[PDB]
């Protein structure tokens, strides 16, 4: 499910909408939770 440039719709930003919206994975986890330097933007995180 890739990273490569688009060739169907906008797959740059896309997620499951199905034919009716508001559905997502039952097992909600994706990451080890860790805390440290706090930022309020991606841009602020890039600077440091």
């Amino acid at each position: 499910s890739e990273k490569d440039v688009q060739l169907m719709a906008e797959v740059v930003d896309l997620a499951t909408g199905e034919k009716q919206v508001l559905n997502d994975i039952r097992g909600r986890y994706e990451c080890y939770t860790d805390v440290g330097p706090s930022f309020q933007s991606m841009k602020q995180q890039n600077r440091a």
Binding site: Q40, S41, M42, K43, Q44
Partner: protein
């Protein structure tokens, strides 16, 4: 009625530190957004 007042030279000193370090508006841009509107919002701020 006497006075000594160790109270006020400490309060005077603590205030003078924040006088020489004033804080105004900066408008850093949000997550995934690069600077564009940052000068627009500061443009109206700096004139008035």
């Amino acid at each position: 009625r006497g006075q000594f007042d160790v109270v006020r030279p400490v309060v005077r000193k603590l205030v003078s530190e924040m006088r020489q370090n004033p804080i105004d508006v900066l408008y850093r841009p949000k997550d995934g957004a690069r600077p564009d509107a940052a000068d627009v919002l500061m443009g109206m701020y700096r004139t008035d």
